Amino acid sequence: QVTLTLVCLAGLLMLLTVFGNVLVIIAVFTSRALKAPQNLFLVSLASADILVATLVIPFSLANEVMGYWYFGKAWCEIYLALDVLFCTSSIVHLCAISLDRYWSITQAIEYNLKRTPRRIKAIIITVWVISAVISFPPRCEINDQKWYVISSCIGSFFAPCLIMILVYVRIYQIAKRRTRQNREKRFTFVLAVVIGVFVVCWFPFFFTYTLTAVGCSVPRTLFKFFFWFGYCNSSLNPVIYTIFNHDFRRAFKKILC
Amino acid sequence: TLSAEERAALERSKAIEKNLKEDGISAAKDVKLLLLGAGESGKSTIVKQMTGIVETHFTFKNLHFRLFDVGGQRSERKKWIHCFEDVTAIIFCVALSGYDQVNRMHESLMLFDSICNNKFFIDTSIILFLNKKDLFGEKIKKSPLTICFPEYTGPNTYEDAAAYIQAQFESKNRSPNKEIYCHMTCATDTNNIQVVFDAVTDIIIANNLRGCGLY
Amino acid sequence: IAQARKLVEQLKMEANIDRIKVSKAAADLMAYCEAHAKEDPLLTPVPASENPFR
Amino acid sequence: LRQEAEQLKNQIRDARKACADATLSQITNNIDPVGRIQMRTRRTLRGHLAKIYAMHWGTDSRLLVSASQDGKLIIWDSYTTNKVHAIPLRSSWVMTCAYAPSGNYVACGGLDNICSIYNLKTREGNVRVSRELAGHTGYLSCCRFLDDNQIVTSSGDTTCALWDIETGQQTTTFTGHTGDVMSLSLAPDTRLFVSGACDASAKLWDVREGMCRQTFTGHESDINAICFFPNGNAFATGSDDATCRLFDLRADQELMTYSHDNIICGITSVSFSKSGRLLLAGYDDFNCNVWDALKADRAGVLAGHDNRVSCLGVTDDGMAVATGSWDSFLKIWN
Amino acid sequence: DVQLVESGGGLVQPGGSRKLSCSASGFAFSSFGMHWVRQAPEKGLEWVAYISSGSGTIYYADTVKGRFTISRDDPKNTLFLQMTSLRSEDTAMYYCVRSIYYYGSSPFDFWGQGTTLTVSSDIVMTQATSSVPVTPGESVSISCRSSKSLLHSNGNTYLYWFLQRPGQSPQLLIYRMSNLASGVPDRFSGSGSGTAFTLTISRLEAEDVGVYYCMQHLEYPLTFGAGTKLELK
Ligand SMILES: Cc1cc(C(C)(C)C)c(O)c(C)c1CC1=NCCN1
């Protein structure tokens, strides 16, 4: 009976995600100050977000809105793989961005000699192909082979999460060591947010498959909530990675005016 | 569409664009420094230690440095100062010893203030060199202190006055997020490149978290 | 001394100019501007066609 | 006696005042004001990588050259935005450029205190340096081609010189300003020219005689740009005072005052239209206004660049106008 | 100064394979697009091949396609045309030309010397007659005709004129039918309509006697016209 409100919510998500990602894209392309080799990761992540929000979401919403997949074996079998690809792409991009930061903050000169767009593009292609190899193998259903689901879950979430935690902890420690007072609070808040939104919006889902699938099976109606939460990160992340960057702040102000 | 000659012209334009882009990417790797002393300061000493603008570049630990010293320009600096707006950092030299020739300390301090507070050029870190340690040290103990600065009211010698004038110089640094490094040279030390290297690596680190603001 | 002599020698020359009246000069400028106001494209926009910058 | 110098100043000021009736505040009021004028960008040249300080149109009214701190000169094709040539400079510090009327030569200079001449039409199909005019002491400020073998320059020495390119030696010098000279413009007759200096005054010069003929004053602060009238009978002056003024070369007095309260910032360049009705002037506030020549009304405005408009030029045919800014972008407005 | 030298000629039986090499010296060879032009042993001229400045674009005529290839190596300052499977009519004299394209360029300005060789739709140009009697000191005009109008939308009528003195390599005279090639007397004048074109020679001297051609550059393949020889009746 509230299906109209649900579709309104879905459309709001569509518009917010697409607007944010396109704003980021235009800001990065249209400004000279943002002409650095480190912005291509943001470009790729925004693209991913655009694709996933524009085409994956509508079919998922159509599914489970009445309980049946009105299409046949076309295209469910490729839709599942496409969704998996466009999701894990964001996670891999976040991990790569964090690693690049870390390497930039520590050992600045040596790495500094290796920021040519050639390496950045190679990294992006590697991230897309690793996502492809993760996704491709082997009443629209989902796979149940435990040896597949658990491995995919761990390799897609736990390792990137561990890397992000370690690198950001290392960065915070270095910033504290160079702190030797007012900004101490000002920037401790920023780091949490970057590592906070990522885990809160995504930790429950993988956790659950890792649970409720191999161990004791405990299905609950909150899965739907976990699934829905799994998507909004794509819309939150573009904003998180740009609100704290002055040049992006000026670009957005110019676009506004 | 377009004719064959126009197609050839477009291809030539694309080749020119690619060559220019590659040249720019290659050039943007090195670090540019500006040396702005005052009068008889040890700018000549520093540059030799290593009729218009003079450029001398050197490579230290696979890092290319380009140094500029606009000393020959006798015209007013408020014009043409804006040229060096996108510079990694600047280097300033004073002395220590000479502080009674006129005075010299007041002139250097006002010049430093003027260059450190500009509408642009406001967020560039500063490296400050105190060369000619030996002459200052010998001048103090025989003719203390005076100093021209009144209301000193501190210990006579030696690091007392050294740090006092140092702090006087780190003063009048209004803006945050912009550090002033310092070092005292005897005009015979052979490690100035080391301190410059440390300062530049610290500055680039600071820039990195700046983007990753952090902020 | 030398600077004063040069300055006075220069200033002696500017005393020779007439000058000419200002109203007549303004009339000349306005007349020329009105006369040439026809062929200037910025003043009168050209048609969308025959414009090198489409 | 300096008192005799100031007595001569007083008497000449009195004569000038006696030779003034207009005002220029009631006359010209009856003409049809142009009102607001709409301008739209047409092309955007995005090849550079750093600040650009000077540009110049060719006599053909299609090609132009721009100089930037990256140490390169680009010969653009405005109709197609094609990079005709890319010239690597010996010294990366440049502050001016000029385009020869014949189109065979282009000159540029800056803080290096020398003016380099480049030959475009060469047997080997590649540009080369023809002459390195090195006589000045200060930084170069402006250059202009009198003809294929005569170039005028202004530097920080508070002086200007006329050169013989093939000989490579100065043939005349101007030493009256007593203050840094920043810009100059050649009269259409190619016989007289004027220059602007930081001494808050401008002087007219005679090319053949090599001596000043008239000195203009009444301006509060530095002057950054000057340009002649199409008829070669008047000129306008830029400033850091945030004001523009134009003087008559025969009546020898100030005429107009282009002042608006809302704008308090330096003026980087100025230019006229083909008929002289439209006055153009860059500003430090990132947008260049358009002023009526004889109404002192801000007719229009041009949005962009980011920061900051520093050089502009109008084609000989007047078709379009180009502007440049420290963001490494050129725009064509029609 | 600028001068092109080449030596790869010889006598090869039908269907043989050879290589042609002309070496540049005296200019920025790496910044010029190079062509090859074949002059049949008796008469005539026809475009053969073309390689762009960065070797990023290559074109061929019909009879040449599939049997010949063109290559270059900028560091060595050499141009290569590969002879393979040559047929009976391929025997001819060959020239390698230099050409650069931008606003107000002068392509086909300078030609090579030539190296002999023995063995064993498209725009069409018309000229007539092939020999007209002329004497010194009196004006004359030569006309060339095409099928499709050369007037492009830009207003550039792509037409070129060349003069080949008896026993010497040709040289450019007029490009785009309205300009004048460098180092040429001002008596020559190019004019014509969008399909028909003519010349105008004044104060003729004994040095102007030769055979002329008309060529277009609007669209590949480049097609040469017939030769009109001048004499000293
Ligand atoms: C649905 C899904 C399932 C898995 C398995 C393999 C864990 C079943 C995945 O790895 C991935 C990436 C997805 C993609 C997705 N989940 C919620 C929203 N979009």
Tab-separated table of N, CA and C in Angstrom, chain C residues 12-20, chain D residues 12 15 213-214 249-252:
chain	number	residue	atom	x	y	z
C	12	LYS	N	60.243	73.891	-21.505
C	12	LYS	CA	60.139	74.992	-22.455
C	12	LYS	C	59.402	74.570	-23.721
C	13	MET	N	59.543	73.307	-24.129
C	13	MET	CA	58.895	72.850	-25.354
C	13	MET	C	57.380	72.788	-25.196
C	14	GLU	N	56.892	72.256	-24.073
C	14	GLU	CA	55.450	72.120	-23.900
C	14	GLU	C	54.730	73.461	-23.870
C	15	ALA	N	55.436	74.560	-23.604
C	15	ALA	CA	54.803	75.871	-23.654
C	15	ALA	C	54.468	76.297	-25.078
C	16	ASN	N	55.046	75.637	-26.085
C	16	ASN	CA	54.860	76.078	-27.464
C	16	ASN	C	53.546	75.572	-28.051
C	17	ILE	N	53.073	74.405	-27.611
C	17	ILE	CA	51.855	73.825	-28.167
C	17	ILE	C	50.721	74.820	-27.947
C	18	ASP	N	49.677	74.743	-28.777
C	18	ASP	CA	48.765	75.874	-28.926
C	18	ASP	C	48.079	76.237	-27.603
C	19	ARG	N	47.230	75.366	-27.040
C	19	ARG	CA	46.716	74.119	-27.605
C	19	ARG	C	45.475	74.401	-28.450
C	20	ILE	N	44.830	73.341	-28.935
C	20	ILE	CA	43.573	73.468	-29.664
C	20	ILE	C	42.429	73.299	-28.674
D	12	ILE	N	51.994	76.674	-17.632
D	12	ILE	CA	51.439	75.753	-18.618
D	12	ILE	C	50.125	75.153	-18.126
D	15	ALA	N	47.584	77.790	-18.807
D	15	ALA	CA	47.230	77.824	-20.224
D	15	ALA	C	46.297	76.675	-20.585
D	213	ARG	N	57.495	64.985	-26.734
D	213	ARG	CA	56.786	66.170	-27.200
D	213	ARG	C	55.733	66.657	-26.221
D	214	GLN	N	55.055	65.747	-25.525
D	214	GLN	CA	54.040	66.114	-24.551
D	214	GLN	C	54.051	65.111	-23.408
D	249	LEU	N	45.446	64.262	-27.746
D	249	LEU	CA	46.844	64.535	-28.057
D	249	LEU	C	47.106	65.962	-28.524
D	250	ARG	N	46.051	66.706	-28.853
D	250	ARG	CA	46.210	68.063	-29.362
D	250	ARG	C	45.737	69.021	-28.276
D	251	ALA	N	44.583	68.755	-27.665
D	251	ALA	CA	44.088	69.583	-26.574
D	251	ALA	C	44.849	69.363	-25.274
D	252	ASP	N	45.521	68.214	-25.152
D	252	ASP	CA	46.352	67.876	-23.982
D	252	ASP	C	45.685	67.918	-22.602
